[PDB]
Symmetry: C4
Subunit: 388 residues, 4 copies
């Protein structure tokens, strides 16, 4: 095995094609299936895996009551091959209420954060063993991407935040070689608040599109140089903005440099990626709620401030159905690197009160250079058929 360098060009993208769906909530009504949230996908050089943060319980289980909360000592990172729902044979890779994972071409890295909110521990596990750890630097919920990290030539990078979710916080970018932290760089640039970054290789470095939970409904961008550890940051130029909540399409804006101060408080994890001067992006269809999911290309939406010229829209989840977090992962083909994304389909409390639990399923799409049609691929469980 050799280290990945991701040195091939990005594949041509005309949109996205269906790749995977796990139906886990429908299965949970007739099977012992983990309660999860914050899923993601990452692939080793041969095959893809799904990940999520368990809640230390199956769904048809009294312990699924009041699983809406994000952080408990029972959450662990689950990992199975993609399309295998999280069943009782699934491996719990580490103790985690926040995580990121990625394969460097030779082995898996996992970054797993657990413990007290004011004094958490992040463990760094590589090739099946603990190699490093850090404690919280700001004593305010050390936390990370909830999607794949990215490794180039054996140096893996991951973005972490510690501090307020509604004010200035302290974000840092770690550089990790065979599980050992070799450098830590502070965030720099124009991004004012960065959470839950969705990162991808853009040789020779790494590019991330994140969540501003404070003043922006436009998404931050963080670029990472893995050779000299420098960082720059700004916001996606597109005037069709990617966060939820957000204003309507006519009222929304971005001009690349600053948070837009438009319904900027709160947010949802999401993604975007550049294609020349254009941007491909996903977002919820609702502007207020995590309902529906659409993708499209904004023409000149990477380079031109406030462009709203979209094309190539696809509905992934219709507006009548629940969505959730979403994130990017990248897959090496014969001659190019493709971009794919997952959508978390959240079910249960607080929004659906017929049940006491909160969980999710996933759906997953990959870039295509071919053609495609239309559809909608929601979670599909009937809340009234579920165990309470």
């Amino acid at each position: 095995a050799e280290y990945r360098n991701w040195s091939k060009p990005q594949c041509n993208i005309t949109g996205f094609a269906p790749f995977s769906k796990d139906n886990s909530i429908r299965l949970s009504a007739g099977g012992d299936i983990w309660v999860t949230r914050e899923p993601y996908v990452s692939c080793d050089p041969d095959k893809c895996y799904q990940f999520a943060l368990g809640q230390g319980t199956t769904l048809n289980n009294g312990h699924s009551n009041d699983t809406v909360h994000d952080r408990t000592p029972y959450r662990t990172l689950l990992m199975n091959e993609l399309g295998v729902p999280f069943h009782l044979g699934t491996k719990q890779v580490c103790i985690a209420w926040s995580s990121s994972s990625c394969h460097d071409g030779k082995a898996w890295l996992h970054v797993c954060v657990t413990g007290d909110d004011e004094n958490a521990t992040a463990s760094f596990i590589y090739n099946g063993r603990l190699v490093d750890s850090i404690g919280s630097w700001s004593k305010k919920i050390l936390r990370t991407q909830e999607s794949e990290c990215v490794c180039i030539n054996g140096t893996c990078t991951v973005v972490m935040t510690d501090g307020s979710a509604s004010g200035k916080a302290d974000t840092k970018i770690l550089f990790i070689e065979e599980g050992k932290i070799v450098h830590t760089s502070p965030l720099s640039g124009s991004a004012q608040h960065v959470e839950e970054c969705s990162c991808y290789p853009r040789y020779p470095g790494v590019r991330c599109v994140c969540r501003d939970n404070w003043k922006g409904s436009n998404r931050p961008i963080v670029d990472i140089n893995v050779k000299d550890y420098s960082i720059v940051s700004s916001y996606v130029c597109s005037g069709l903005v990617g966060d939820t909540p957000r204003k309507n399409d006519s009222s929304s804006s971005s001009h690349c440099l600053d948070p837009n101060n438009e319904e900027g408080g709160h947010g949802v994890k999401g993604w975007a990626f550049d294609d020349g001067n254009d941007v491909w992006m996903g977002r919820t269809i609702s502007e207020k709620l995590r309902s529906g999911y659409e993708t499209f290309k904004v023409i000149e939406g990477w380079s031109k401030p406030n462009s709203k010229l979209q094309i190539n829209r696809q509905v992934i989840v219709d507006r009548g159905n629940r969505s959730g977090y979403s994130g990017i992962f990248s897959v090496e083909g014969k001659s190019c690197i493709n971009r794919c994304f997952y959508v978390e389909l959240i079910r249960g409390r607080k929004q659906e009160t017929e049940v006491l639990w909160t969980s999710n399923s996933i759906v997953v799409f990959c870039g295509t250079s071919g053609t495609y049609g239309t559809g909608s691929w929601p979670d599909g469980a009937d809340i009234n058929l579920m165990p309470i």
Copy 2:
């Protein structure tokens, strides 16, 4: 690993011997087992796998109600080693309400169709990654074989249809190398309607026996040249015809060129293969319903129009028990290529109303050059012991 060429001769066939059975409906009454339909079998160079289209639910689950329908956004292609019933650890390989899979000697190809009836997407997944996609060309339920595709020297071929199920439709043959579509040829020849082809390697090309849903109770044949992409087609010569519904044995006929216009509307997926001038074929024992299953050789039934001289009959499922789709797969031996087949054993609605679900189990037989006896290997579940 090397590409398969399937260049060995067909094995000698004196009939068929038992190979596998999964008992999945009996197990579903005391276990969490997927609801399926449209199963098939395909082998990599070492071992065989069973496949089927899940319904996004287990059987003992409220979501198994009204699983008679063919297309939903929750159907996914399931894949396990042959003889492992579809349990909660089974991988959902792709999103699909129509599919075909095959191994080229180096990796698996999956062709997976999902989305809206009038604007579906087919994804082409090879070696664990999405490589290509197409949209519907006729806006009328793009669909494929529901059994294994066939690859020679790294070029895999698969037959797809789009258009009416009871009128002229548009069938195309795709040629796919490492997941990338390199050519598409239209159907040509005397076959007038082609669905759900059962294809096999017949070096140097591929031969298929299919379902005419419009005017024939005789089965179409499609031959595919993988070098120059040419296509020819006609109908199985045997006057003992392979579709259901069909007329009785004295009234039925075929003369090789045209659909017989004998109870030709509707049909069932099935198979046949040539053995010199003779044909080996399966069919339901009932002429009207998907009940029982028999195989036999028709002497000169490949070459002589309307031959009805059978020999070497075997009952696979007695006339009192349900059958379903059936299809061929091929397995390389030391010196010859063998032909095998599966039978889908459908249980539940609409025919059996004691339950609300529709599902299936499988039984599987392989060609033999040896000897054998008699038996009957039906699904075996007692409908009155099942969850509703």
Copy 3:
């Protein structure tokens, strides 16, 4: 990989030590576990597997009612690593109501008999594919060992019977190379009725100890030459006889040549093996019922007619608990070939009427050259805690 030749000497044996137990009936009261009977063990060069004939159902399942019967079209051969109980992820290797399996050093052979009692089919599956088949030669329940076959230099041998279970029958020894039957020899010698042979490599050939269901409570021996296909047979010399039913120890006898005509009708599968002039053997502790299980060495019990001088007794299952079939398997060590055995622990009907099903668990011991103590390792389920 190379073919096994089993050319090392037999290990020194001072008795037997515990090796495995699956607890499957206790687990069946809180888990979805197959209903089985006729288990056995066989090892590839690295690790051991347990096998059994399923009944097409789990235990907590309405289909477990009236699973006392030996032959149905739903029975399949199950195979898992040894110590993994038969759960819903277990592979059903073939359709079988009688079977034998063995690994030749390169791949697995399975011999699987199914179909009608008067016209069964045996399939021969090697390296994952069907290679050969035969039909019944006497039209009276073609059947085989229910324990491992044995392969030397790529030639595997298996003993099969067809004909009366209470009169002269037709036994044959098949010689199978990479799944293909290359020769069939009739039984020859002084054994008058041979069923369910427990065979082991005794380089340069194979030795079997079997069940006489007609006139002997002493067990037949069949010796097989794999080079020239010749066969000889007789009966274990020990006057402590191995079958059940049998007379008491003072009344029982054997003089090596003939069935003893002592409670000879009926029987149970079992085993013995030679150690110089001595014999190591197992048997039920009860003389009438399949209750308890003991092993011991009879001094000069291989060579001296009617020797009853035992030593080195061990209780494996106390007399108060149920046993069942038992059989031998052999395991290659660094410098010697060891002998091991399993015991089927049968629970349920007809003897235990609190439940409607019949099933079993297993316990497994291996020869030792070391020391050991005493114990009893019965099934352990409480019949009153079981699903009906």
Copy 4:
């Protein structure tokens, strides 16, 4: 593969970071999960496995009643990858009510003790086969570590005891090469009673920290030379003592040579390891009960009699929650050998009478040279939501 020698230095330790948690009791309320006790962890050169002694039953099962007892013929050693809870697909490696396992770099050794209390058998299984056995030498519950053994250059060592749990007993150290016992040495030195040793490689030999069940609340140390088979022993010097029960911190003492005679009767399995003149150790937070779990370093606590100067305390399980046995395992990194530990989190009877069963989950931490925060990671099941 090569034999492990463990010749690298011990890693620098600043404390411990979270590594794994299985949540098995919470899962048992909605899933078929084994009833266990006496767990441990051991790693092959690539990945870690969890082990425990099953009780021959799942938890939601009538057979889980009265599983408080330590020894039955149904207990077997379970083994899965670390973080996979013990589910129905888990392999039962051997019959055992006491065990130890370890990987020599090429294959696994298991030491498995079962049978009658007064005449037990220990089986020695290596690379999947039984290689050796011994019987009890003192006829009083032959027993072993309940945590990993240690192998250097192909010689594995394991500590065993036979005799009184409250008086002088006979402890022996066995040296085992590819499963064969090559030497047995008696305990020698100042340790007066030794049970349940937690051993680790300390090149060129092995060091163990154990449980004195008779007169010490300070833990014994046993050092083993694997070249010449010599043994020495004494007690951990730290005046902060590691057993439970124990006196309070001001009253407790140790002076390295003798059991302290301070609440010395009874005990719990636990661990400690040297770091220069300092000692890292775990213990329950309660002095009387198996409640809470803490680690810390005692400065000069390896070399200076009765040192009580602690630093670097961490709570692993808060004082309000149950703990249990604990033990060490060692993991090879790129340049150093790390020390890790597990804690058994016992639930059920006798202490918790709402249920009839006794079982456990695990939590696992590894040494770090980095930084970390605070937390508490208890079992987390609600006893009132459990099956009885």
